[PDB]
Structures are given as C-alpha cells and as structure tokens.
Paper text:
All of these kinase-dead mutants were subjected to crystallization trials, and fortunately, the K40R/D150A double mutant yielded crystals with one molecule per asymmetric unit. This human [name] KD-UBA structure contains residues 2–335, which fold into a kinase domain followed by a noncanonical UBA domain. Notably, the UBA domain of [name] ([name]-UBA) binds to the back of the kinase domain on the opposite face of the catalytic cleft, which is similar to that observed in MARKs but distinct from that in AMPK. Binding of the UBA domain to the kinase domain of [name] results in a buried surface area of more than 1600 Å2, which is significantly larger than that in MARK2 (approximately 1200 Å2). In the structure of the CagA-bound MARK2, the active conformation was induced by the presence of the CagA peptide, which mimics the binding of a typical substrate to the P+1 loop in the kinase domain; however, the P+1 loop in our [name] KD-UBA structure distinctly protrudes, which would obstruct substrate binding. In our [name] structure, three residues of the R-spine in [name] are in perfect configuration as observed in the active MARK2-CagA structure; however, Phe151 adopts a distinct conformation due to the mutation of the preceding Asp150 to Ala. One disulfide bond is intramolecular and formed between Cys154 and Cys168, and the other is intermolecular and formed between two Cys169 residues from symmetry-related molecules.
[name] ([name]), which is also known as murine protein serine/threonine kinase 38 (MPK38) and [name], is a member of the AMP-activated protein kinase (AMPK)-related kinase family. [name] is a cell cycle-dependent protein kinase that is involved in the regulation of various biological processes, including cell proliferation, spliceosome assembly, hematopoiesis, stem cell self-renewal and apoptosis.,,,, and comprises an N-terminal Ser/Thr kinase domain and an adjacent ubiquitin-associated (UBA) domain. However, [name] is unique among these AMPK-related kinases in that it is not activated by LKB1 but undergoes autophosphorylation at the key Thr (Thr167 in human [name]) and additional Ser/Thr residues in the kinase, UBA and TP-rich domains.
Author numbering: 2 to 335
C-alpha cells in the first residue's frame, strides 16, 4: 500500500476536488493537529507528464509568498506522488464570491491587487503561470488570496520555446497565442488572463463566452467584447491595456504594478515582494522540534536547513503558521 508512509504523518478527510490532474483530499497533520490539503497523483496514470510534474514541483519549492499557496511536504511512492499544501477554507474565487452578481470597482481592486502581487512575484522568480483561472485562486480564513502555482494545463511544445494551453476549461481565460500554441513570453499570456479576471470581477460574466467551442475560440482570437454601462473610464482603460490580442501591446507588469487604476484607492503600487521570506529559522519552532527530536539546537537547525520538504519541513512550516495565528507553538506528541 502506497498510503502507509503517508498515513503515519496524516489522517485523511473527505475529498475536496476530484479535478483533472490530481485528486485533492483535505487532511490533518497528526503532529500539529493542523489542516492541510493533499494533492494525490498516480505516476502510472500521469506517465509521460511525470517529468514535467517533477519540474513543476521544483518550481513550487522556490516560491514563498503571502499570496501563493504554500507547499509543505512532497512524498513519492512507487505509484503515487503526494503534494501537501496549505489548506484554504475560503475556497475557489467564486466559492469566496458568495455568488454575488458582481463586485464593485473597489471590491475588485482589493482582490485584484492581491492577484497582481502573486503573479508579479512569480514572474520575479523567473516563471510564468500560464494558467490563471478562478479555480487556481483560493482564499484562506483571512480572505487573502492564495494562488495555486502548480499545474499541467499550459505545457511547452515544439523545438521552439513555445507554450500551449492544454485544458479546454481554461480557454476563456487563456491568451489567443497561448491557445494557438504559439506562446513565448508567457508572462504576457498572464497579463491577458488577469485582464479576463478583472473583467469578470467587475461584470459578473466573461468578456468572451460561448456554448460552442469554436465560436468561443474565434471570439477570443478577434478580441472584441461588450463594455457594461457601470464600468468607469479608468476600469475600461485598464481592461483595454490588458486585453490586447497582440501580446506585445499588452501592459507590462512594471506598468501594471503602479497603474493609476491600481493605485487609485491606495496611493501605493502593488507590493509584490515576499513579505514572509525564509531568512532565519524561528527559534521557538526549532526548540519545539528538538524537544520532539530529543536533540540539541544546532543539530536541529542543520537538519531543518536541509529543507527537503520531508515531514520535518512540513512540521516546521505548520508550527510556523501556528505562531502566525497566535496559537501555541506546540506539537501533539504524547
């Protein structure tokens, strides 16, 4: 059984999403009693995608940001790969919307600034997302966005350095050239997707939408959309600057960060740099672990620092999160 190794660190809970690429189960990390989400993949099912899944994980390991969903633990079995991630109760973007017909300009600005923060960080690390959509946008118990920075939807193709949108669900949020599989400079692809998001937040429907798939396909490639009466000029403008069929004509991140629409109620640009980066080990978390590991501090630190996203790394991070909730930094041992 592949689960035996996992089952000694976690007890399972009712599944959250069947989804395409991975089953996702809600779970309890035994040592800390904290909730986590676990992504379960089947290596035999994934087959040829497995190499890419591994590089996507390597990418995720290098992301530590206030609006990126945190990775805790990666466990590999003969047949399975388990990803353990921060759990986000608020649910997906529209689980968090509360089904309200649409958000006001200031209501969307609050959310949208967080999306910009997350994506800017990702780009700063030298990656593009290439699959920004509502189900990749979760909300934690504080109603802060946590982006899922991991996916198999957008994939590289060809001898050239091109990317292709693979998930037909993602279509309405995907840039034209990405859909065509002629996307290089994928970061521009991301600016397009946020434009779509921006539109939906303020309007309560998509700018390009059709039951027919070719029809929807064509509307996107053509780039024309309705502009509701209730959108402000500023809103409308920012939309135009993002929703450009020509990738080269889409607003740059740099100009997005400090856009007048973006700065309008805040008078400071999006703060996209990691506010919680890994500088030094938190002493309390270390003392707690060494109590449990029955060892000395330096030894304990050196061990955490290997930072293998093993059960140790997960335990460290969950204790860390506990301190941040203002909870006791304690383990469940005994």
């Amino acid at each position: 059984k592949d689960y035996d190794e996992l089952l000694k660190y976690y007890e399972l809970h009712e599944t959250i999403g069947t989804g395409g690429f991975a089953k996702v189960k809600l779970a309890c990390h035994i040592l800390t009693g904290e909730m986590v989400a676990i992504r379960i993949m089947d290596k035999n099912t994934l087959g040829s995608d497995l190499p890419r899944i591994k590089t996507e994980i390597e990418a995720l390991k290098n992301l530590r940001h206030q609006h990126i969903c945190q990775l805790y633990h990666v466990l590999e079995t003969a047949n399975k790969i388990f990803m353990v991630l921060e759990y986000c109760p608020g649910g997906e973007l529209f689980d968090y919307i509360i089904s309200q017909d649409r958000l006001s300009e200031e209501e969307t600005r609050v959310v949208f600034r967080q999306i910009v923060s997350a994506v800017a960080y990702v780009h700063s690390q030298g990656y593009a997302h290439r699959d920004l959509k509502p189900e990749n946008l979760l909300f934690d118990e504080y109603h802060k966005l946590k982006l899922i920075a991991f996916g198999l939807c957008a994939k590289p193709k060809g001898n050239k350095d091109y990317h292709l949108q693979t998930c037909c669900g993602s279509l309405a949020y995907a840039a034209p050239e990405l859909i065509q599989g002629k996307s290089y400079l994928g970061s521009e692809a991301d600016v397009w997707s946020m434009g779509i998001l921006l539109y939906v937040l303020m309007c309560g429907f998509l700018p390009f939408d059709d039951d027919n798939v070719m029809a929807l396909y064509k509307k996107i490639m053509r780039g024309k959309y309705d502009v509701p009466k209730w959108l402000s000029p500023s809103s409308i403008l920012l939309l135009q600057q993002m929703l450009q069929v020509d990738p080269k004509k889409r607003i740059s991140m740099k100009n997005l960060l400090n856009h007048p629409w973006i700065m309008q109620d805040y008078n400071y640009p999006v703060e996209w740099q990691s506010k919680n980066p890994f500088i030094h080990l938190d002493d309390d978390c270390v003392t707690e672990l060494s109590v449990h590991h029955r060892n000395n501090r330096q030894t304990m630190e050196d061990l955490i620092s290997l930072w293998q996203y093993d059960h140790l790394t997960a335990t460290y991070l969950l204790l860390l999160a506990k301190k941040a909730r203002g909870k006791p930094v304690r383990l469940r041992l005994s």
